[PDB]
Amino acid sequence: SINDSKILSLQNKKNALVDTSGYNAEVRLEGDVQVNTIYTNDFKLSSSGDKIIVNLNNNILYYENSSVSFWIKISKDLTNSHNEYTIINSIKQNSGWKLCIRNGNIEWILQDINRKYKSLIFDYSESLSHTGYTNKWFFVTITNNIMGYMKLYINGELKQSERIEDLDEVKLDKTIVFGIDENIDENQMLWIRDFNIFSKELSNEDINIVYEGQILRNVIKDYWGNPLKFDTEYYMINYNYIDRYIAPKNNILVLVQYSDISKLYTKNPITIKSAANKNPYSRILNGDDIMFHMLYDSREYMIIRDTDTIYATQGGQCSKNCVYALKLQSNLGNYGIGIFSIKNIVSQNKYCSQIFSSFMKNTMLLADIYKPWRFSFENAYTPVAVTNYETKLLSTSSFWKFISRDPGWVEHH
Numbered sequence: 001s002i003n004d005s006k007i008l009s010l011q012n013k014k015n016a017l018v019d020t021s022g023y024n025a026e027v028r029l030e031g032d033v034q035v036n037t038i039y040t041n042d043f044k045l046s047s048s049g050d051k052i053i054v055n056l057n058n059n060i061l062y063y064e065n066s067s068v069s070f071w072i073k074i075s076k077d078l079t080n081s082h083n084e085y086t087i088i089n090s091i092k093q094n095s096g097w098k099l100c101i102r103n104g105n106i107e108w109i110l111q112d113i114n115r116k117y118k119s120l121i122f123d124y125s126e127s128l129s130h131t132g133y134t135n136k137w138f139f140v141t142i143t144n145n146i147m148g149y150m151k152l153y154i155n156g157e158l159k160q161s162e163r164i165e166d167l168d169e170v171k172l173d174k175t176i177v178f179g180i181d182e183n184i185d186e187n188q189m190l191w192i193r194d195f196n197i198f199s200k201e202l203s204n205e206d207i208n209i210v211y212e213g214q215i216l217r218n219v220i221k222d223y224w225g226n227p228l229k230f231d232t233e234y235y236m237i238n239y240n241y242i243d244r245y246i247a248p249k250n251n252i253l254v255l256v257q258y259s260d261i262s263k264l265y266t267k268n269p270i271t272i273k274s275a276a277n278k279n280p281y282s283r284i285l286n287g288d289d290i291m292f293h294m295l296y297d298s299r300e301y302m303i304i305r306d307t308d309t310i311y312a313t314q315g316g317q318c319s320k321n322c323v324y325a326l327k328l329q330s331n332l333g334n335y336g337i338g339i340f341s342i343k344n345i346v347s348q349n350k351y352c353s354q355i356f357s358s359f360m361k362n363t364m365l366l367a368d369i370y371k372p373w374r375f376s377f378e379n380a381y382t383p384v385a386v387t388n389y390e391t392k393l394l395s396t397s398s399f400w401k402f403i404s405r406d407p408g409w410v411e412h413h
C-alpha cells in the first residue's frame with residue numbers, strides 16, 4: 001500500500017484534527033484554527049496568527065527519502081502580495097525544511113546545518129490570471145531523495161526538479177509548525193487539506209493514485225475546487241465567457257458582459273435545487289438531477305428549456321441538430337422540462353461540469369453566438385440545449401463553472 005509508508009497523516013476524527021498514521025504525533029491547535037469547514041481534513045491559516053503545532057514521535061526520524069503531499073488554496077489577497085510568508089516551518093538549529101509563499105509562488109526549502117539551502121518554486125498565480133490557481137485548491141507533492149533530487153508535482157504532474165547533492169547534513173526537526181504571522185489584514189488566508197508525510201519517494205503513478213483519491217471524483221466542484229452545494233448562490237458561467245452574466249431578455253436567457261471587466265462576482269446568481277429530495281445544502285454529485293432557480297427583480301424563477309427551437313421554420317418538427325433557448329418560469333415545481341443532470345467531464349479533473357437534459361430528446365447545454373429569438377435576426381451570446389452533441393463533448397463551449405462568493409476572493413469589500 002501507498003499508505004503503508006505514511007509516517008504522519010493529519011485527519012479529522014471524532015471532530016478533532018489528529019495524526020491517524022499509527023505513530024501518534026502530538027497535534028496542538030492554537031488560536032483560530034477552523035478545521036473541517038470545506039473538506040473533512042481541512043484547516044485554515046489566517047492573519048489571526050492561528051497555529052497547528054505537530055510533534056512527531058522522534059523515533060520516526062531513525063532521512064534517505066520522503067514525500068510530503070497536501071492540497072492548498074491561497075487567497076487572492078495573499079497571492080497578490082510581493083512578500084514572503086512561511087506557511088509550514090520545520091527548521092530548528094539551522095536545519096530542516098519549510099514551505100513558503102512568495103510573490104504568487106509556492107516554495108519548498110530544504111536547508112543544511114550550515115544554513116545552505118535548495119528550493120523548488122512554482123508560479124501558481126500567473127499574474128492573478130483567471131487561468132492560474134489563485135484561491136483554487138491544487139494538489140502539491142514534494143519528493144526528496146537525499147542522494148539525488150527533490151521534485152515538485154502539481155496536480156500529479158512533475159513541474160520542477162532540484163539537485164540536492166551539494167547540501168551537507170540536514171538534521172530533521174521533529175516539530176512542524178503550520179501558520180502565518182498575525183496581521184491586521186483579515187483577508188489574508190489560506191487552507192490546507194489532507195496533509196501527509198511518507199517515508200519513501202512516491203512514484204508518479206502513486207502520486208496520481210493519491211491525487212485521484214483525494215479530489216473526490218464523485219463531487220461536482222465550484223470554480224475554486226470546493227464541493228458544489230445545493231441551495232447556494234453561484235455566478236454560473238460558461239467556460240468561454242467568464243466576463244458574462246445570465247440575464248433574461250425578451251423571454252429567453254442571454255449572456256451579457258458585466259460592466260466591470262475585472263470582476264468575478266457579477267449579477268443574477270442562481271441557486272441549484274435537487275430534483276430528488278436530497279438534504280438541504282448537501283454536496284452535488286456526479287449524475288444528480290437538478291433545477292436552477294434565479295431570484296430576479298424580486299421574483300423567484302426556475303430555468304426551463306424552450307419547447308421549440310430557435311428557428312421558426314422548424315416549428316415543432318426538428319429531428320436533428322435541434323437548438324433550444326432557455327427561459328424563466330415563475331411557476332416553481334419539479335417540471336420535467338426544467339430538470340437537468342450535472343456530470344463531471346470524463347477524464348478531466350478541471351473544476352467544470354457538463355449539464356444535460358433528457359426531456360423528450362437528449363440535449364446538452366452549451367454557449368455560443370446564436371440568433372436565439374425565433375422571429376429576429378439579432379445575435380446574442382446564448383446558453384442553449386442542443387441535440388446530437390456527441391462531437392461537442394470535448395468542446396470548451398460545453399463546460400460550465402459555478403463561482404461562489406468565497407472568503408479567499410474578496411471584491412469591493
